[PDB]
Amino acid sequence: MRECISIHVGQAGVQIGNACWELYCLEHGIQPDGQMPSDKTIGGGDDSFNTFFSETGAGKHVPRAVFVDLEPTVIDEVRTGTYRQLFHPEQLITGKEDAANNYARGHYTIGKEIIDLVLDRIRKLADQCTGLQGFLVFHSFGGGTGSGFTSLLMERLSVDYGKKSKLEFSIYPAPQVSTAVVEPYNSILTTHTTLEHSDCAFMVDNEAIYDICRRNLDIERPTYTNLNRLISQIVSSITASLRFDGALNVDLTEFQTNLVPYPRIHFPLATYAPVISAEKAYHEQLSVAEITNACFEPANQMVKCDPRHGKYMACCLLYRGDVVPKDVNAAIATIKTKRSIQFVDWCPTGFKVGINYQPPTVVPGGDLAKVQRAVCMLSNTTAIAEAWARLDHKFDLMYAKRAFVHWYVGEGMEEGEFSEAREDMAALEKDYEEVGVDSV
Amino acid sequence: MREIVHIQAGQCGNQIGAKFWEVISDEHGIDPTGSYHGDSDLQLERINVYYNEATGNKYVPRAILVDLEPGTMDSVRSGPFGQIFRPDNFVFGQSGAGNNWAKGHYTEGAELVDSVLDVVRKESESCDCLQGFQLTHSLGGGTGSGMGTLLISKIREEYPDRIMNTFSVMPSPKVSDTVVEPYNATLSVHQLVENTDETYCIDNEALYDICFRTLKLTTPTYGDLNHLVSATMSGVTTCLRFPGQLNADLRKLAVNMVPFPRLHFFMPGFAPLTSRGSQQYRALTVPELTQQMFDSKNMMAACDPRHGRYLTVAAIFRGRMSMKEVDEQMLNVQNKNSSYFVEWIPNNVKTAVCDIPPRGLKMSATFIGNSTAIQELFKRISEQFTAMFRRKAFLHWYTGEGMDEMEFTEAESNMNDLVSEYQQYQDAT
Amino acid sequence: LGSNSQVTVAVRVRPFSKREKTEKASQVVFTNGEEITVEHPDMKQVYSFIYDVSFWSFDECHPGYASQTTVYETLAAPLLDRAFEGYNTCLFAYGQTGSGKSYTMMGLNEEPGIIPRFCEDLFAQIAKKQTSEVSYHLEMSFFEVYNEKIHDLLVCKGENGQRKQPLRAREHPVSGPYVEGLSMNVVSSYSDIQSWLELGNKQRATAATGMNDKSSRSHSVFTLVMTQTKTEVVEGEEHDHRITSRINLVDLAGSERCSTAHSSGQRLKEGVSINKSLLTLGKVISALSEQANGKRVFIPYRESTLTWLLKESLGGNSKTAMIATVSPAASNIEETLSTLRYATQARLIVNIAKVNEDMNA
Ligand SMILES: CC(=O)O[C@H]1C(=O)[C@@]2(C)[C@H]([C@H](OC(=O)c3ccccc3)[C@]3(O)C[C@H](OC(=O)[C@H](O)[C@@H](NC(=O)c4ccccc4)c4ccccc4)C(C)=C1C3(C)C)[C@]1(OC(C)=O)CO[C@@H]1C[C@@H]2O
Ligand SMILES: Nc1nc2c(ncn2[C@@H]2O[C@H](COP(=O)(O)OP(=O)(O)OP(=O)(O)O)[C@@H](O)[C@H]2O)c(=O)[nH]1
Ligand SMILES: Nc1nc2c(ncn2[C@@H]2O[C@H](COP(=O)(O)OP(=O)(O)O)[C@@H](O)[C@H]2O)c(=O)[nH]1
Ligand SMILES: Nc1ncnc2c1ncn2[C@@H]1O[C@H](COP(=O)(O)OP(=O)(O)O)[C@@H](O)[C@H]1O
Ligand SMILES: [Mg+2]
Ligand SMILES: [Mg+2]
């Protein structure tokens, strides 16, 4: 009984959470009604694992998830959908006054009326814990909730709990594509506030996943269900060692160590190679020598930043299925002998490994195929600086004419804070430059 | 929940309001008597955005009419959708303004704005939350312009933190809907630029051309023009009344479209418009909409966007669709026609989506655009204003009803300063 | 459209405050003479700034100690002299809550600022010219901005739970913008001016905050209209020439980071209203600085009422002084940098002050 607590903030968070708990439910057999025909069928079992789920004497397994938001258009789909008899009715919807895509509303004005309830709910889900391990936020840069509420929440949780992991997932803004013209402000501000309180922040980018879904699965008209299912498989792969039996198990405290060298450079990138439909499920062997060489391809990442424009700095590879630990070592070795994948002269290892025996599930009427083995790689590399610089440039083009600043000011934000966030984020680019200069 | 308070100031506002109610009801399933008669459930869930409950599952609308003359109220009462309104919200008078702003902002309107604000208070305080108002008025008159501007002023003095969106009609360039237009229009712009958060500009000539060119209508009544205007008024609130993948309330559009406060005057548009015969030859996919929305013909603003640069654009879609298509299409539209956009806004497009489409179209949309091409509409008004003010062509009727000559120069200076504010960015730096 | 002119800028550091001493705050500001230098505490980078005038009030013992009787004779005396020469004049403040911008202008009962010294030098200099050839007349006004609404300061409110008369602005075609219902009272002796200023200071809105126990949460303006009628060569009756002048003394408020100076309710609202007013004036200065560089630029005055009622002072026809009050604290370092940045961006403004006289003959 060691427990992790999921928190979902915003439309994107709630959608990724729905896609994630669908996967968990189809994995353990735990159903929408909270009842599991696995403990009361064979004569015993612990299939619904109590790390992400809970238990009630009536067989109802209520999950550990708040599903926070500030607009009832999203949570009411859960409350009036299939997974209504599963969650706790304390979903912490406000019903009122969406943030309108600014950081100041969801950090000062409307957020402060709602955060104490969320903290009380987290405390109530953490007092029946006999020692938890960490949190998992699902926020989206390019909004008011994902940018401000996550900042306030990781700021309050760095005061009460303190010595606990506070990992997060983040929809990195695409450079060209974007569904908002006020997102760079919120992005730099959240990277100013969610820096000294968080530990690791796994980034994704809807453009790269569009491209890979087009190239591999052959979908020309994808919608966010298929995107969130990939992200659900990723968050399952990074949360399986607690939830299933394995050989070389990874805990949540081991991401802060092998991946966050400096306390500010903790912005890695996810990748999940065996993305193949049922048609291409055949004609491929799908061994580790193919997978791990596909996960490092530039055209299979989840962020739109070429790894070849920078040196790799750390990598955590987490496998699932029939993996014999000789193909993994051979794959890492033949990946090390390549001249494109370039490592820095203070991390020769850079190849953390993790194995698990439970294969991945499959959603009916889905998009992916039944593959006996899966892989998920999380890379901390120095290319991200370029992407950050792009956003930084946007911040310098729009702030130099005080555009949109009345809206942030109207919710109490103090322009000096914007300049401070800019100067703070520039030093991080300078740090990414420092960590490429090889030793003398 | 979010709740809009409709107001209908003048004849045009009343007609558009009736058509919009006759549009939103058939969308939510309400009948003329007030009862629910539907097929789905997502209608009654967010019905409080526009409606209230009376007693027996009856649904009355949150409309608050105002009109100095008595005819339009009786036309809206005796019409088809007239038995559903609240009769105590009819707040009219007699002895209309007479195409005089002075007789609709100081003398006659001063006697009835109190009653209209009483109804506004009664209907607003009932609400749990409040997202803003939604007025419809027509420059070129005294009831609409005067009374609506005074009401906006008094509301923004009372309820400031909300949005006083209004779907104003502007005067056409060539034909004159009324002789003394520039006085009233310039004064209304003086009383709107500083007392609003968003505003929409509709013009009759653009809608005539849309009716004749795309829809292939040779005799379009006012009802068709209005039926071409309630469309976007629905599309704006579609992401509040219905669910979707990417939601966008009015405040989100306001934050993303108004980079500087005064520059909130926009150009609206609808997507799938076609003749009753040429519908079986067209493909109901997304790029056909996206090229039917950016064209300089669908825009009701009577100002070609090609003569300026889109500072901002916003697109509210409604249907089962793929977001890759929408995002990539907006990206390639920005890349192709880069000269018609700006460079210091890197991404100059906002997207927003619903999932419950319209009554008969599998795929609908709505477009809003802040461009520098709308400075022409005010340049024209100011030129007419100078031509008619340099020797005081029709001014003595405005002074006698309590006004002076300095307010006119104030409004002229403000309108010209706004034109200059747009022209500062019309030119590539 | 007469003679050219330039904006005068002056900087002023305050000594430590109690909240800074309790927090063990360091000295991140130093003078290398007439200049200003800031060293970030972490020792990563330096910045330097040069102005036309600099002051120092960190301690009473250093050399070059610029006190209240010194900033006047360095900055304000030229304004009174150019007023007697006919020109218009403005002096306006800038800074952060607690920086000392309602201590340099108004002052204390035992440490007068410019306002209780300007209108005294006025009368000490008029007594030397009380002859029958130049006859003077002085009118005063003292108004306030609160929550983007104008208010009059020198008016006895009627007995009621809420009596603060809202007023409106209006654009004159020739002169410029102005206020309606303004009590443009008359002044003859200091005994009346001091009383009016006492009533104003009483009526100005005040409250307690974390950075100032007596914070002023409104934008105050003190206007003096001076007119001197003079005799010249004429064919008939004498005393026909007239020279006019306006003297504006403007006390602004601070940015007020709403987290540190924690407050909720009306205080937060007027702080954000104050913040919006401060946010448009920086835009205005950045737009007026780019006039001299040779670029076409818009100068938005109508996004805030303060800039709307001070168009003549930033640009227009007025020789203008900018007093930038800063802090030596290491915690209040970014805001001080922003103040100095807006100051050096305000130096580059060029205005056109013209001697204003109507012969009427
Ligand atoms: C199979 C089919 O496509 O039928 C269409 C149709 O043929 C056309 C002509 C419809 C038709 O639209 C018009 O006839 C029309 C006439 C003058 C001015 C404007 C429109 C239609 O009436 C429109 C109507 O669509 C709706 O009802 C929408 O819900 C529309 N409804 C109303 O406005 C409405 C008003 C009064 C009473 C009932 C409905 C709407 C749009 C936005 C938001 C809410 C509602 C439908 C299916 C059609 C007809 C009936 C021909 C179109 O409707 C709209 C708003 O775009 C015009 O182009 C679309 C699609 C077609 O071209
Ligand atoms: N991966 C993924 N991203 C999404 C999804 N929906 C929205 N987004 C991202 O969310 C961003 C804008 O929405 P959000 O940041 O989530 O806004 P929010 O968190 O709901 O907060 P609000 O402003 O109240 O809507 C966009 O840049 C999208 O890329 C989704 O279903 N999946
Ligand atoms: N676009 C549009 N304009 C209309 C409609 N009905 C009337 N108008 C125009 O609105 C203008 C202004 O009329 P109005 O101000 O209401 O007259 P008033 O009652 O004296 O104030 C008239 O010149 C009409 O041509 C309509 O349905 N749509
Ligand atoms: N030069 C100075 N010497 C000593 N104290 C000063 C000086 N300047 C300011 N102060 C102190 O700072 C305070 C003035 O700050 P103030 O300007 O009133 O804040 P605000 O302008 O934000 O309302 C007073 O309490 C005063 O004692
Ligand atoms: Mg939202
Ligand atoms: Mg003060």
Side-chain angles (χ1 to χ4, degrees):
Chain A
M1 188 87 96
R2 74 281 196 193
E3 313 203 8
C4 293
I5 292 152
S6 71
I7 314 183
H8 309 67
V9 58
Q11 177 87 253
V14 172
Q15 303 261 9
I16 285 155
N18 199 353
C20 169
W21 288 106
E22 190 185 15
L23 193 144
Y24 290 10
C25 281
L26 267 293
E27 271 186 1
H28 306 135
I30 176 63
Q31 270 173 0
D33 313 331
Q35 299 193 351
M36 169 169 92
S38 169
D39 198 348
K40 314 218 197 286
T41 43
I42 62 156
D46 190 275
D47 216 40
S48 45
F49 264 85
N50 311 338
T51 296
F52 274 79
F53 292 79
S54 317
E55 206 198 345
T56 301
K60 205 167 182 180
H61 304 345
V62 187
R64 309 211 197 287
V66 194
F67 286 178
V68 184
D69 205 324
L70 307 168
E71 186 189 16
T73 50
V74 183
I75 294 283
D76 290 345
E77 291 184 310
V78 171
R79 191 180 294 151
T80 310
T82 308
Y83 300 123
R84 53 169 199 281
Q85 272 170 24
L86 192 66
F87 303 99
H88 201 312
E90 304 295 346
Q91 291 278 61
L92 282 295
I93 198 77
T94 299
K96 310 167 163 55
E97 300 294 74
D98 194 292
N101 210 313
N102 54 16
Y103 167 87
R105 204 163 178 79
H107 201 266
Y108 286 102
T109 72
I110 202 78
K112 64 170 195 293
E113 303 183 7
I114 305 298
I115 190 69
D116 304 277
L117 213 58
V118 181
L119 264 290
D120 287 27
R121 192 69 247 168
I122 284 155
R123 210 166 64 209
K124 221 169 279 297
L125 277 177
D127 290 348
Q128 70 189 313
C129 280
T130 179
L132 60 78
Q133 300 221 257
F135 282 94
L136 287 88
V137 181
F138 303 87
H139 60 110
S140 187
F141 300 151
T145 65
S147 280
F149 190 89
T150 309
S151 306
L152 203 71
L153 184 38
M154 298 298 98
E155 175 170 358
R156 295 289 197 92
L157 281 159
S158 173
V159 168
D160 303 358
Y161 288 83
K163 290 270 181 181
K164 306 290 204 313
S165 299
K166 286 164 269 169
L167 312 175
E168 56 192 347
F169 284 62
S170 310
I171 313 310
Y172 195 68
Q176 300 282 45
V177 172
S178 288
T179 63
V181 310
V182 300
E183 64 177 18
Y185 306 86
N186 309 326
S187 280
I188 286 92
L189 284 156
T190 311
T191 315
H192 172 35
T193 56
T194 59
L195 207 76
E196 308 192 355
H197 299 288
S198 170
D199 295 4
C200 191
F202 303 113
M203 274 165 173
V204 299
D205 195 12
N206 62 296
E207 186 175 356
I209 315 181
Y210 294 163
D211 285 7
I212 202 177
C213 190
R214 189 261 297 289
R215 168 158 53 262
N216 291 335
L217 303 175
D218 276 316
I219 287 157
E220 281 286 351
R221 293 151 149 70
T223 184
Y224 287 2
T225 57
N226 288 283
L227 286 298
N228 293 326
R229 280 171 175 161
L230 274 299
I231 306 309
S232 157
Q233 290 273 20
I234 290 154
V235 70
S236 167
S237 50
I238 200 170
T239 61
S241 64
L242 312 167
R243 191 174 68 242
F244 278 117
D245 271 314
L248 204 167
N249 304 327
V250 297
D251 312 278
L252 267 67
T253 61
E254 267 292 352
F255 304 119
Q256 184 271 317
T257 50
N258 306 322
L259 203 145
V260 178
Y262 292 10
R264 297 152 72 75
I265 295 155
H266 52 56
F267 296 105
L269 319 165
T271 290
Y272 175 86
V275 166
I276 50 171
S277 50
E279 297 146 53
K280 297 173 184 302
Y282 317 111
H283 309 135
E284 283 291 339
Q285 322 196 289
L286 312 167
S287 66
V288 186
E290 186 62 21
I291 290 156
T292 323
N293 200 2
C295 306
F296 272 112
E297 277 188 346
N300 290 67
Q301 285 284 335
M302 301 297 176
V303 64
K304 203 78 172 290
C305 204
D306 204 326
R308 300 167 292 191
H309 301 149
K311 323 286 201 80
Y312 274 91
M313 209 142 59
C315 278
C316 164
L317 281 45
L318 302 169
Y319 291 13
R320 307 189 80 175
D322 198 320
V323 167
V324 62
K326 183 166 72 66
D327 307 301
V328 187
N329 193 357
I332 286 157
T334 195
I335 289 159
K336 284 160 87 80
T337 58
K338 289 173 82 73
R339 195 171 61 259
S340 315
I341 314 314
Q342 204 181 2
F343 284 86
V344 188
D345 71 330
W346 56 262
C347 175
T349 62
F351 275 113
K352 173 66 171 154
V353 184
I355 308 302
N356 193 317
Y357 290 140
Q358 191 70 8
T361 196
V362 295
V363 189
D367 184 18
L368 297 86
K370 209 202 180 185
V371 183
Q372 285 135 31
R373 59 189 87 67
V375 173
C376 175
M377 79 163 290
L378 310 178
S379 43
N380 195 349
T381 188
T382 58
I384 198 74
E386 287 284 359
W388 272 132
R390 197 171 276 112
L391 274 173
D392 181 76
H393 190 33
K394 300 172 171 196
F395 190 98
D396 195 6
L397 276 177
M398 309 164 75
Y399 179 68
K401 315 218 282 188
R402 262 63 172 179
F404 302 87
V405 187
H406 45 304
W407 289 107
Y408 310 116
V409 155
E411 278 57 31
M413 191 55 190
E414 197 271 326
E415 180 182 54
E417 178 60 16
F418 284 19
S419 185
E420 161 168 4
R422 171 52 151 86
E423 292 178 355
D424 203 345
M425 188 63 213
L428 193 70
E429 175 170 34
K430 200 165 169 292
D431 294 3
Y432 286 110
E433 165 163 4
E434 264 190 13
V435 299
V437 182
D438 294 308
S439 182
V440 291
Chain B
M1 306 298 95
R2 281 68 52 89
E3 306 195 44
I4 288 152
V5 174
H6 203 258
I7 305 180
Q8 299 169 16
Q11 192 167 232
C12 183
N14 292 15
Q15 294 291 323
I16 288 157
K19 184 53 77 162
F20 178 46
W21 286 119
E22 178 152 9
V23 147
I24 196 77
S25 173
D26 120 299
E27 250 194 356
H28 286 335
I30 304 302
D31 69 333
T33 52
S35 287
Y36 165 83
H37 288 290
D39 57 357
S40 158
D41 190 302
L42 295 151
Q43 303 168 342
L44 292 148
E45 190 175 0
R46 303 284 152 211
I47 206 169
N48 57 7
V49 170
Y50 279 124
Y51 282 70
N52 287 357
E53 284 148 27
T55 67
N57 287 68
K58 177 160 182 151
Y59 292 109
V60 308
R62 211 184 278 105
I64 299 167
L65 283 86
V66 69
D67 199 42
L68 306 176
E69 61 182 293
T72 319
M73 302 294 188
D74 294 358
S75 168
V76 171
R77 192 195 282 120
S78 73
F81 291 80
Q83 268 63 35
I84 202 184
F85 286 107
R86 202 187 282 271
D88 274 325
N89 289 6
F90 300 140
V91 175
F92 58 74
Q94 313 288 18
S95 64
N99 297 321
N100 196 355
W101 184 90
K103 223 168 279 186
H105 201 273
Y106 282 113
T107 62
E108 288 293 344
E111 298 171 7
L112 217 58
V113 71
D114 308 335
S115 184
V116 177
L117 280 168
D118 270 349
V119 183
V120 163
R121 285 205 263 283
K122 190 209 297 306
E123 274 287 5
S124 191
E125 286 283 2
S126 178
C127 316
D128 293 331
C129 167
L130 196 80
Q131 197 77 307
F133 283 76
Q134 197 186 348
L135 176 63
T136 317
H137 64 276
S138 180
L139 279 62
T143 299
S145 284
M147 207 52 169
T149 49
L150 186 80
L151 265 165
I152 290 159
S153 168
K154 287 193 163 36
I155 287 155
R156 164 61 60 92
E157 191 66 20
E158 282 195 345
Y159 302 92
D161 61 313
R162 271 87 192 188
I163 313 308
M164 318 312 152
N165 181 16
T166 189
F167 275 81
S168 165
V169 164
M170 307 303 288
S172 43
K174 299 191 286 175
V175 72
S176 64
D177 216 3
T178 307
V179 177
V180 290
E181 266 176 349
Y183 297 91
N184 308 336
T186 311
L187 279 150
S188 194
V189 168
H190 168 44
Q191 275 285 353
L192 271 171
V193 165
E194 65 189 29
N195 289 320
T196 42
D197 270 294
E198 75 181 59
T199 294
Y200 297 81
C201 281
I202 292 156
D203 194 81
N204 263 323
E205 289 288 348
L207 276 151
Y208 295 143
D209 185 74
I210 288 155
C211 285
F212 168 61
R213 193 166 286 169
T214 311
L215 288 164
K216 300 284 183 52
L217 272 180
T218 59
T219 61
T221 177
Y222 292 109
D224 290 7
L225 271 53
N226 298 318
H227 183 295
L228 243 183
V229 169
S230 300
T232 193
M233 295 218 286
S234 292
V236 164
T237 74
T238 196
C239 302
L240 292 170
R241 297 170 282 131
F242 305 106
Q245 292 285 335
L246 198 147
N247 280 306
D249 79 317
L250 275 150
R251 214 182 269 286
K252 197 174 208 159
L253 313 177
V255 163
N256 299 346
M257 288 204 73
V258 184
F260 301 83
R262 298 151 56 72
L263 309 165
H264 57 66
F265 288 97
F266 300 155
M267 311 186 155
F270 201 49
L273 290 190
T274 155
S275 32
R276 285 197 182 95
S278 304
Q279 166 56 347
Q280 58 183 358
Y281 299 142
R282 290 172 70 271
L284 182 56
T285 76
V286 184
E288 191 66 41
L289 309 191
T290 308
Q291 74 95 26
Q292 195 163 23
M293 294 147 56
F294 271 78
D295 60 345
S296 69
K297 300 168 188 182
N298 281 48
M299 295 306 91
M300 305 166 190
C303 301
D304 267 11
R306 299 184 294 264
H307 288 106
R309 312 190 101 193
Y310 277 117
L311 267 174
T312 48
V313 283
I316 294 155
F317 296 88
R318 294 168 85 191
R320 289 274 171 190
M321 281 199 316
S322 65
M323 295 298 98
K324 188 204 194 302
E325 268 188 328
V326 166
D327 293 340
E328 292 288 357
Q329 274 286 327
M330 290 295 180
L331 170 53
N332 70 32
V333 165
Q334 288 176 235
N335 291 350
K336 284 173 177 172
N337 311 340
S338 186
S339 166
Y340 305 156
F341 296 78
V342 286
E343 53 172 2
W344 61 265
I345 287 158
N347 182 289
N348 43 59
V349 170
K350 178 60 174 69
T351 45
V353 176
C354 171
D355 192 18
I356 286 280
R359 209 52 169 186
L361 289 65
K362 293 190 207 171
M363 220 168 279
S364 167
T366 286
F367 190 70
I368 309 167
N370 197 345
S371 73
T372 65
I374 203 73
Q375 75 188 17
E376 294 170 359
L377 194 139
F378 304 157
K379 210 165 171 287
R380 193 173 65 230
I381 285 155
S382 167
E383 285 172 337
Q384 294 188 26
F385 196 95
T386 55
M388 296 154 78
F389 182 80
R390 184 177 290 169
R391 48 172 67 173
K392 320 203 190 299
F394 310 85
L395 188 135
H396 65 279
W397 285 119
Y398 299 77
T399 62
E401 303 297 338
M403 295 172 62
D404 210 353
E405 186 169 331
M406 65 208 313
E407 190 73 0
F408 294 81
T409 304
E410 292 160 60
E412 203 195 343
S413 190
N414 202 328
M415 194 183 249
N416 293 348
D417 288 7
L418 183 70
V419 163
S420 201
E421 187 167 22
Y422 267 124
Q423 192 170 8
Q424 178 53 45
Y425 312 129
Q426 199 202 54
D427 272 297
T429 73
Chain C
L1 279 291
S3 67
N4 200 348
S5 283
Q6 191 149 21
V7 175
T8 292
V9 180
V11 57
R12 191 205 177 83
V13 311
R14 62 136 168 70
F16 285 125
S17 68
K18 304 207 310 201
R19 188 168 180 280
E20 289 165 4
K21 290 180 184 137
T22 289
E23 275 167 67
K24 316 302 186 193
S26 293
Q27 188 72 2
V28 310
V29 305
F30 301 107
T31 43
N32 297 28
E34 200 165 8
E35 318 303 337
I36 284 280
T37 64
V38 304
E39 318 294 342
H40 206 270
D42 53 45
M43 211 286 294
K44 78 192 194 172
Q45 205 184 350
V46 190
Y47 312 84
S48 162
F49 295 118
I50 177 154
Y51 297 143
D52 292 331
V53 179
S54 158
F55 295 143
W56 198 253
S57 185
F58 177 56
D59 285 326
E60 296 157 54
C61 313
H62 289 239
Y65 184 62
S67 173
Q68 288 279 20
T69 47
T70 315
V71 305
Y72 187 94
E73 308 198 346
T74 303
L75 191 65
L79 314 191
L80 182 60
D81 270 14
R82 299 292 175 288
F84 277 11
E85 288 197 355
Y87 301 164
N88 280 317
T89 52
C90 192
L91 164 55
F92 64 107
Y94 198 89
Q96 166 183 19
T97 61
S99 79
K101 39 191 185 315
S102 48
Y103 184 91
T104 189
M105 296 295 283
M106 289 296 298
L108 271 290
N109 286 96
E110 51 269 47
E111 292 297 353
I114 299 298
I115 286 158
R117 292 194 189 282
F118 191 94
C119 204
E120 191 274 331
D121 192 316
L122 185 70
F123 287 14
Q125 206 78 245
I126 206 163
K128 314 204 194 299
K129 319 182 196 293
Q130 206 70 12
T131 189
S132 43
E133 286 154 39
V134 194
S135 188
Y136 286 93
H137 196 227
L138 303 164
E139 301 186 89
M140 89 191 297
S141 279
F142 196 42
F143 60 93
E144 186 184 18
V145 187
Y146 155 88
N147 196 27
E148 323 167 86
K149 269 185 277 180
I150 306 302
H151 284 349
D152 197 73
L153 291 158
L154 52 89
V155 68
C156 275
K157 75 189 78 166
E159 283 307 337
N160 189 26
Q162 188 284 299
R163 270 277 194 201
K164 295 290 283 287
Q165 189 62 21
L167 277 171
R168 297 186 65 258
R170 211 86 74 73
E171 181 58 25
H172 196 272
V174 174
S175 88
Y178 76 107
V179 193
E180 192 181 9
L182 196 63
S183 288
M184 185 150 268
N185 283 114
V186 71
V187 306
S188 66
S189 278
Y190 189 104
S191 66
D192 286 298
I193 287 145
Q194 204 73 356
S195 66
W196 282 127
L197 277 171
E198 178 203 357
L199 171 48
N201 306 341
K202 275 172 41 53
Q203 276 275 34
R204 181 173 186 173
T206 55
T209 56
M211 297 292 286
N212 228 37
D213 51 358
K214 210 157 63 60
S215 75
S216 42
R217 325 189 42 49
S218 282
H219 297 312
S220 178
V221 178
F222 178 85
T223 300
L224 276 188
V225 190
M226 179 162 73
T227 66
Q228 49 188 352
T229 47
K230 192 180 240 173
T231 292
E232 54 190 57
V233 299
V234 291
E235 64 89 21
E237 188 201 43
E238 309 310 278
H239 275 138
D240 316 297
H241 184 71
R242 151 173 308 94
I243 294 161
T244 306
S245 292
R246 298 202 86 161
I247 296 152
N248 271 331
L249 309 174
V250 178
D251 185 296
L252 304 190
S255 289
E256 191 170 337
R257 196 84 78 80
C258 71
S259 87
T260 74
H262 211 180
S263 42
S264 181
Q266 199 73 359
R267 306 302 188 265
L268 180 58
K269 196 152 72 71
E270 62 199 353
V272 44
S273 296
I274 276 325
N275 255 318
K276 282 180 155 187
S277 297
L278 292 211
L279 156 63
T280 69
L281 198 59
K283 203 190 302 197
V284 166
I285 288 150
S286 280
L288 288 165
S289 72
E290 295 180 11
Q291 279 290 332
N293 273 21
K295 192 181 282 186
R296 59 174 290 166
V297 292
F298 182 56
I299 40 168
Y301 296 92
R302 319 210 178 200
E303 308 187 358
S304 68
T305 314
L306 186 64
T307 50
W308 178 227
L309 292 163
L310 280 167
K311 197 204 279 195
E312 282 178 21
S313 66
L314 313 184
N317 47 320
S318 178
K319 219 169 285 305
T320 193
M322 188 187 180
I323 180 152
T325 66
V326 309
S327 167
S331 170
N332 306 278
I333 189 168
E334 299 296 339
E335 302 76 20
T336 289
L337 265 298
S338 159
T339 291
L340 300 190
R341 204 161 279 149
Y342 287 127
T344 182
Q345 286 190 359
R347 293 180 69 193
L348 312 183
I349 293 163
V350 285
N351 301 337
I352 47 170
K354 74 189 184 82
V355 66
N356 46 358
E357 66 290 341
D358 293 331
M359 262 65 69
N360 202 5

